[PDB]
PDB file of C-alpha atoms in Angstrom:
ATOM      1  CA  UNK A 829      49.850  52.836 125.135  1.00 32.55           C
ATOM      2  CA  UNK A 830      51.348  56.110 123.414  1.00 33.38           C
ATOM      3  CA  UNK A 831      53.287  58.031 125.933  1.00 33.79           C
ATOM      4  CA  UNK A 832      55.985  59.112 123.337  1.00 32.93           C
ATOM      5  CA  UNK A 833      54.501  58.155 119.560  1.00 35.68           C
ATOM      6  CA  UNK A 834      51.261  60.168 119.150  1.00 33.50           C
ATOM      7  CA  UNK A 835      50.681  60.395 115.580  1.00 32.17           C
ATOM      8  CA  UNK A 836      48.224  63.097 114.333  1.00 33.18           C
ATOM      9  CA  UNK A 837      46.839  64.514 110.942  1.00 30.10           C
ATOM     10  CA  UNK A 838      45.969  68.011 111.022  1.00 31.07           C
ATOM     11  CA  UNK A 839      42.970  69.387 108.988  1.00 34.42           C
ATOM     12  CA  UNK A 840      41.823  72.822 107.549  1.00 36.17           C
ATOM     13  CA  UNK A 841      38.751  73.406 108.863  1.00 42.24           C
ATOM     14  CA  UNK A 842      39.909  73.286 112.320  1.00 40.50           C
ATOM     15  CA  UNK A 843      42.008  76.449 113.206  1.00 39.81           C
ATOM     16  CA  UNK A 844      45.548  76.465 114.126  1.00 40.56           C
ATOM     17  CA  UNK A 845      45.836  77.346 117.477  1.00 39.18           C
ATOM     18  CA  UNK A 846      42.909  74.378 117.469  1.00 42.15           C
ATOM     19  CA  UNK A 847      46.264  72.111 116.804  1.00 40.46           C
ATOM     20  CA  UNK A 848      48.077  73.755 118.884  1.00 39.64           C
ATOM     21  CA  UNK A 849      45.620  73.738 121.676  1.00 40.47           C
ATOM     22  CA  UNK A 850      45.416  70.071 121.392  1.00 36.47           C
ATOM     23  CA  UNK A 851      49.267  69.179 121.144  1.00 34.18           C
ATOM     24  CA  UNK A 852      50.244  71.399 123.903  1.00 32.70           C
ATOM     25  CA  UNK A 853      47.566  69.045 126.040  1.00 34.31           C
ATOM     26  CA  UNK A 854      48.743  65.910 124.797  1.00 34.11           C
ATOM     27  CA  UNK A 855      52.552  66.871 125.408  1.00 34.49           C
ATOM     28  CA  UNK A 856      51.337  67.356 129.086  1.00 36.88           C
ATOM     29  CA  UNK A 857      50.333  63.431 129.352  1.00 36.96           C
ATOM     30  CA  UNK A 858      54.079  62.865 128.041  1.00 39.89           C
ATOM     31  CA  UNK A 859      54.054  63.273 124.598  1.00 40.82           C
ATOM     32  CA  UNK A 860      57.267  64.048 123.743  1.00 35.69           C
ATOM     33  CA  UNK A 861      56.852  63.216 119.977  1.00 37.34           C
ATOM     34  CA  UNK A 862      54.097  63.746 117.859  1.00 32.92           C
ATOM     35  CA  UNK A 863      53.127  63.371 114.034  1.00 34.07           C
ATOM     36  CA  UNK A 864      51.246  66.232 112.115  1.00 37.61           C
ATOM     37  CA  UNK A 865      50.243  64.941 108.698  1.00 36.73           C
ATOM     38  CA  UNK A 866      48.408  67.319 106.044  1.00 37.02           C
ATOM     39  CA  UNK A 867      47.286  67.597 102.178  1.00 38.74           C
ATOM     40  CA  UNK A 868      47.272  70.591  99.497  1.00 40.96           C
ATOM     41  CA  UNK A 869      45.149  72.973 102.267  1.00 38.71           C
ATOM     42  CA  UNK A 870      45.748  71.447 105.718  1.00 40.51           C
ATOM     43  CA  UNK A 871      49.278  70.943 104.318  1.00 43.64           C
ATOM     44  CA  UNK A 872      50.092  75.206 106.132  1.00 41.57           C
ATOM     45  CA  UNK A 873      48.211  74.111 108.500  1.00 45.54           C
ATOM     46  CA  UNK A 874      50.503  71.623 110.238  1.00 44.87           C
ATOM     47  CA  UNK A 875      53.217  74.123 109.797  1.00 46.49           C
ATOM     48  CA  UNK A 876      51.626  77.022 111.888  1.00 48.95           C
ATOM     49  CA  UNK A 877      50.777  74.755 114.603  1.00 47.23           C
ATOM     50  CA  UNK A 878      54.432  73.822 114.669  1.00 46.02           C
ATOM     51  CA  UNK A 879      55.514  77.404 113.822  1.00 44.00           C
ATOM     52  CA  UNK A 880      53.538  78.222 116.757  1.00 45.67           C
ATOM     53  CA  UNK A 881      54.558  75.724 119.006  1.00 45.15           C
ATOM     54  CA  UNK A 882      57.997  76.413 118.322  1.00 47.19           C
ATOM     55  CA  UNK A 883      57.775  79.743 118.957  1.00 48.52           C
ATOM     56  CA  UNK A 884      56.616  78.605 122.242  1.00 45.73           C
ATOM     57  CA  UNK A 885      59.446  77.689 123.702  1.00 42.84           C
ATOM     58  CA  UNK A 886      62.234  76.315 121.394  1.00 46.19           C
ATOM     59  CA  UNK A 887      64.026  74.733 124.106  1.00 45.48           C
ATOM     60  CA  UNK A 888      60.713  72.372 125.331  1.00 47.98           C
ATOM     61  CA  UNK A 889      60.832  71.503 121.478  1.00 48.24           C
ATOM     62  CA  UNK A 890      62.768  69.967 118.986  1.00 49.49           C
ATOM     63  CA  UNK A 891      62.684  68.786 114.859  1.00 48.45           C
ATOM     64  CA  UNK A 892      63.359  65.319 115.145  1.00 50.43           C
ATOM     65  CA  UNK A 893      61.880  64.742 111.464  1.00 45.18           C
ATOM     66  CA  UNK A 894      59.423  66.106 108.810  1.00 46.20           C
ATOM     67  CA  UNK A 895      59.209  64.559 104.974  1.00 48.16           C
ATOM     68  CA  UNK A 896      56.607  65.393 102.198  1.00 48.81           C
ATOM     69  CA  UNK A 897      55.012  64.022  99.366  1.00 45.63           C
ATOM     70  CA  UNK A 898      52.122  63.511  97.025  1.00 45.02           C
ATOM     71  CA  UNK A 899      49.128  61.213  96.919  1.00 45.68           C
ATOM     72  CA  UNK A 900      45.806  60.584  95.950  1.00 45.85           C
ATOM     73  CA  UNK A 901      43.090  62.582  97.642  1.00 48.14           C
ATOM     74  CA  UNK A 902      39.102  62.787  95.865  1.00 50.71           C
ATOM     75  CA  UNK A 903      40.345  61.061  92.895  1.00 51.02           C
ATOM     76  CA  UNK A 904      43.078  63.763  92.440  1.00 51.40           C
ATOM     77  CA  UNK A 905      46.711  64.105  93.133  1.00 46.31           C
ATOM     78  CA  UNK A 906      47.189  66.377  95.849  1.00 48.65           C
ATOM     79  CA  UNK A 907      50.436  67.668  98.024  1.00 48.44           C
ATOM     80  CA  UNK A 908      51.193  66.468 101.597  1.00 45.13           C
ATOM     81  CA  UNK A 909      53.582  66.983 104.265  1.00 42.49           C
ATOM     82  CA  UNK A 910      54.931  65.040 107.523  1.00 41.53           C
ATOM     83  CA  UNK A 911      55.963  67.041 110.272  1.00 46.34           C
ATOM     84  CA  UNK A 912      57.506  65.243 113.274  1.00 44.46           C
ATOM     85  CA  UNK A 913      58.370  66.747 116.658  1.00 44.53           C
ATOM     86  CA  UNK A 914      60.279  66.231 119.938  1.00 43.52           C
ATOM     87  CA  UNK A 915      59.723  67.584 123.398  1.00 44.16           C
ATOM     88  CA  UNK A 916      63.439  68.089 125.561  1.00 41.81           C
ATOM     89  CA  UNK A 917      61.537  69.987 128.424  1.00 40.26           C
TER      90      UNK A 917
ATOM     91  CA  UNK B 199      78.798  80.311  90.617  1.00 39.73           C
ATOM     92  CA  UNK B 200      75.867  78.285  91.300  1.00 36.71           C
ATOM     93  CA  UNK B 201      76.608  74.470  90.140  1.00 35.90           C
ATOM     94  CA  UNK B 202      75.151  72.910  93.471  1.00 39.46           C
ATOM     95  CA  UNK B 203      73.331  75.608  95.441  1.00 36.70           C
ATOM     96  CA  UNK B 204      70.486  76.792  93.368  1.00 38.40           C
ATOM     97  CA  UNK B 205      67.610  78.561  96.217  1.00 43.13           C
ATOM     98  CA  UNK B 206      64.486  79.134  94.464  1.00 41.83           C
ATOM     99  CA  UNK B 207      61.405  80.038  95.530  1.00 40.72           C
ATOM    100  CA  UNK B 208      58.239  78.383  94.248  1.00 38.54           C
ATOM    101  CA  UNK B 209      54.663  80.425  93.463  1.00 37.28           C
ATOM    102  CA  UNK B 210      51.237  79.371  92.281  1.00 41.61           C
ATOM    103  CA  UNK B 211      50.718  81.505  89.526  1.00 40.41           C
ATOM    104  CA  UNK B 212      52.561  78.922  87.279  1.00 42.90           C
ATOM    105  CA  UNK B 213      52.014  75.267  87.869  1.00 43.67           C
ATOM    106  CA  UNK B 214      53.471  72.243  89.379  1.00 41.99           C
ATOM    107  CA  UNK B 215      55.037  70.730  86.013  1.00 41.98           C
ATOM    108  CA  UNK B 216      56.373  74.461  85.212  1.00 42.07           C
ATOM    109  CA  UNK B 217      58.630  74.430  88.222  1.00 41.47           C
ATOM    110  CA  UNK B 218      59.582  70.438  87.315  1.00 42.60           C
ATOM    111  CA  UNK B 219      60.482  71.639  84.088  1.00 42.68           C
ATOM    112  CA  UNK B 220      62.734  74.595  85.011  1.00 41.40           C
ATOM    113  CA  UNK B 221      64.195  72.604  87.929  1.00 39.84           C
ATOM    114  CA  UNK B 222      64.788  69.247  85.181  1.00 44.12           C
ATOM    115  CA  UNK B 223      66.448  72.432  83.333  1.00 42.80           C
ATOM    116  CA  UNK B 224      68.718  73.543  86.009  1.00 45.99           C
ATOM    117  CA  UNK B 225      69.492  69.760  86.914  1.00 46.58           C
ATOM    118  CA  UNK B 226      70.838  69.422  83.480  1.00 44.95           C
ATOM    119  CA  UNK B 227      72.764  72.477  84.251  1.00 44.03           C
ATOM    120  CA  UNK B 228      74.637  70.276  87.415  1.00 46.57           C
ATOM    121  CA  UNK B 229      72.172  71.987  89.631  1.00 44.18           C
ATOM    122  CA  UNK B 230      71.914  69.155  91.775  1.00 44.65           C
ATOM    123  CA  UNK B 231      71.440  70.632  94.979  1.00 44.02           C
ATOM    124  CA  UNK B 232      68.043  73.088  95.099  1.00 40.10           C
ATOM    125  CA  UNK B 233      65.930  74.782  97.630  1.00 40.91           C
ATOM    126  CA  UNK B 234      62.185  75.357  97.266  1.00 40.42           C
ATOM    127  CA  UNK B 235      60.398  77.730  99.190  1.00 40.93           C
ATOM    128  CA  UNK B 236      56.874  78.534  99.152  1.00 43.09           C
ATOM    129  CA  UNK B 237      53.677  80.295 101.199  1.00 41.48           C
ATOM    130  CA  UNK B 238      50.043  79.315 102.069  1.00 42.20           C
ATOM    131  CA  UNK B 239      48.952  78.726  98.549  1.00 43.63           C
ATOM    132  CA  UNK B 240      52.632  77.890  96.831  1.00 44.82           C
ATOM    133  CA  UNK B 241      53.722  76.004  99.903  1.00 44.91           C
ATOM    134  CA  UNK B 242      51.629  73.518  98.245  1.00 45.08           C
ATOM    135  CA  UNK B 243      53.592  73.739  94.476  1.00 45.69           C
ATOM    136  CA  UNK B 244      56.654  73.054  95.964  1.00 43.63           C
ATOM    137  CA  UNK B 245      55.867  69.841  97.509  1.00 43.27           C
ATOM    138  CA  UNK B 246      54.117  68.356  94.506  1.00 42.91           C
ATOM    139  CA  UNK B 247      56.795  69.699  92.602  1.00 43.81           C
ATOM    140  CA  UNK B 248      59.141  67.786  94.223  1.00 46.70           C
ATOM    141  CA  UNK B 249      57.185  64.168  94.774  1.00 45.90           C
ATOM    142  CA  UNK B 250      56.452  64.618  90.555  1.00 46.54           C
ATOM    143  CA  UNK B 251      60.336  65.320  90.314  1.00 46.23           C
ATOM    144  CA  UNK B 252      60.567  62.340  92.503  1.00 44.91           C
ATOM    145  CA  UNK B 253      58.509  60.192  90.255  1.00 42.59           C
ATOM    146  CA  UNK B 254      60.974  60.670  87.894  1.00 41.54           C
ATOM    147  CA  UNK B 255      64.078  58.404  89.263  1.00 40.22           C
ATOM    148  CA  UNK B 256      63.427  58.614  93.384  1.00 39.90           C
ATOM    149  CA  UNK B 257      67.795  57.021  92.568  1.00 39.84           C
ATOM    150  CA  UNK B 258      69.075  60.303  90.532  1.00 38.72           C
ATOM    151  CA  UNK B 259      66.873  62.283  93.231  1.00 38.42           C
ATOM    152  CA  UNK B 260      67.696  62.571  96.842  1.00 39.66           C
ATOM    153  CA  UNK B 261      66.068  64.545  99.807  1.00 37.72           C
ATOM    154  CA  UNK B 262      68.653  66.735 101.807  1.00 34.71           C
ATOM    155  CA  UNK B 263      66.331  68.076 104.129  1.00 32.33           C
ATOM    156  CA  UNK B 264      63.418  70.085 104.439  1.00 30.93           C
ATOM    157  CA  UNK B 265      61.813  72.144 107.299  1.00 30.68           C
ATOM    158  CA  UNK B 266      58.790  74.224 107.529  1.00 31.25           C
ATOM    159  CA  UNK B 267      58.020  77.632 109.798  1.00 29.85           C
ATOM    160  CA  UNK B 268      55.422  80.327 109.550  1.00 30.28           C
ATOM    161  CA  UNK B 269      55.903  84.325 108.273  1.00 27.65           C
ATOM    162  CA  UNK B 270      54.428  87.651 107.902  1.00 26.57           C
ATOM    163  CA  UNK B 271      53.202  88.022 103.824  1.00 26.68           C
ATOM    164  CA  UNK B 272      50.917  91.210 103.272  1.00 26.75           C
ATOM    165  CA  UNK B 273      50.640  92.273 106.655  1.00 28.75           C
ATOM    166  CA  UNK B 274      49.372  88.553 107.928  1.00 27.25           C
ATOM    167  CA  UNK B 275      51.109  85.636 109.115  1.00 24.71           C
ATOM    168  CA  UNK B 276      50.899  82.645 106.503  1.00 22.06           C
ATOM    169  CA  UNK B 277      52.808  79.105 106.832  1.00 20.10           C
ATOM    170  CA  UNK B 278      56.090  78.510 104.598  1.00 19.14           C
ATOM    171  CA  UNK B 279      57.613  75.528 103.378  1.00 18.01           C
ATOM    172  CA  UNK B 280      61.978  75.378 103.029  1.00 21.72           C
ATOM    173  CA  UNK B 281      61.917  72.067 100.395  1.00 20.13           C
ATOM    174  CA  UNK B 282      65.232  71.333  99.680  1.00 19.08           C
ATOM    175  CA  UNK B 283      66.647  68.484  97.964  1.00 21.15           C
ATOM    176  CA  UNK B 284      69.872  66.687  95.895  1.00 25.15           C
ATOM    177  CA  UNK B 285      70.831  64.734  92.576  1.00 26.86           C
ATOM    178  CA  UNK B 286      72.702  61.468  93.288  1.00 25.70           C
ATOM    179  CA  UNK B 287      72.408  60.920  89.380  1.00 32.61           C
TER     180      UNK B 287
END
């Protein structure tokens, strides 16, 4: 099961509030955490959705972890980010 | 002074390598703590920055923390990226 380890990739043809939409589901089945993952476009993308969700509460969310690095993407180097999160209410 | 608290912001009029080349610079310098900021479209140089500068030791290169929120730039909102990072070596 994956009541508290829902790992996600965002993209950048959905929206933002599309991620936002969706996490803000999924963190009403109990998932606390949750893993955005994005590359050189979607990369912003993960952010806002955070950005966003943060701005939702605060308190009902937490930075338990976020990294970023490069890899290969279309036979091209391209940047990525991981942005972790944590629910306290 | 400024020998271990260098905050720079990152754009993407230059390049990737030309921010890994003023920040090898700076390094060299005893800049061994650095901040990287960046939006929508630079938010992406910072990170490769970074992973390339990475690529160069991963040891003499460290990862202080990092964290990522959205802002207003030209009357919009666009995502931002706070890359920071430290020199063990």
């Amino acid at each position: 099961m994956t009541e508290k380890l829902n790992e996600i990739v965002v993209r950048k043809t959905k929206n933002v509030e599309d991620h936002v939409l969706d996490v803000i589901v999924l963190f009403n089945q109990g998932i606390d955490e949750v893993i955005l993952k994005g590359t050189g476009r979607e990369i912003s993308k993960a952010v806002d959705v955070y950005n966003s969700l943060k701005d939702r509460l605060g308190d009902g969310v937490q930075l338990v972890n976020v990294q970023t690095g490069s890899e290969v993407r279309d036979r091209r180097r391209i940047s990525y980010i991981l942005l972790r999160l944590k629910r306290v209410y």
